[PDB]
Amino acid sequence: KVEVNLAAIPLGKNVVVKWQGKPVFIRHRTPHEIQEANSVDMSALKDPQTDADRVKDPQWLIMLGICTHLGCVPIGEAGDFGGWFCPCHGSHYDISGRIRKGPAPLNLEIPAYEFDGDKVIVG
């Protein structure tokens, strides 16, 4: 059960923290990214999910940084969709962490988490 201090994370920055040996991605999204995420049509997604189905507070993107293809850790702020790129076999994820191109069949998984003031508790 990991506790992350959200107050420590700057504006448009990515933070990676360990939880059960798996990397947890946390991005403090910018207003523009939040719009980019919630303005995508389901027809363009192989794994249809709204940004709201994936985040509780639009400011905090919290997901397991495990590529759904074969398990590599996607690289932040890379790719053709403004999100993450998996160097292993070329999977591109958007700003909501959804699969947009590549062999990966699913969006980055969202672990269970609850907020508590300036800190979130992943687990």
Place this chain on the structure above:
Amino acid sequence: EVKLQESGAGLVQPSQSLSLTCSVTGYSITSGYYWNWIRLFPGNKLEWVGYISNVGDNNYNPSLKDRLSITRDTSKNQFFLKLNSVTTEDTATYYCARSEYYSVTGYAMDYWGQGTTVTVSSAWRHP
């Protein structure tokens, strides 16, 4: 980018039905959030009329609930407002807008239509 284009009769006679269409491009109605209708009275007092979800569920303001009917057409990607038995009361500029919903921050109307000004006049107008 999402765009909302409004169209319809900019003038109806009292006792009749006002019908406004809200065309959406760049995002499907069935894809997600909430699709609302609101009106702006000349006395500058915005009023929430109601909505239709991506599923097709309605939610109307109790003030007008018994008169209006907000339907949609997935094929053409546009939702409509139908306010029955209008009165000089219903004279306002109507707006259609999308509202997102996040379990923490709640609702928020992020995409607004151009705004269609309707007048409930007894006058004659060329259809």
Place this chain on the structure above:
Amino acid sequence: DIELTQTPVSLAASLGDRVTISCRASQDINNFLNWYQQKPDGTIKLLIYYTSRLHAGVPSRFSGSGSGTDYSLTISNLEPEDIATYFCQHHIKFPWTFGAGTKLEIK
């Protein structure tokens, strides 16, 4: 039904200085308070949601504070197109209700 009261009602200012509008509701709303900007030309935009969160495109000079039943909307400088009518709604329960409005004029 809840109702907001936007005060000051249609107050003007100079060509570049701070201004504080408010919104008090009859009942208690958590922080579910949004703010809209209605341009003179009829174009309405979202400016602030959840009492303090900025929307995409709105300049940094816009703030947003308050809680319980009292709220705010501060500005750094009206330079040069901050002239419009500002509204405010709540969404803790249906139906949503807006404020009386607040016109912003330049002397």
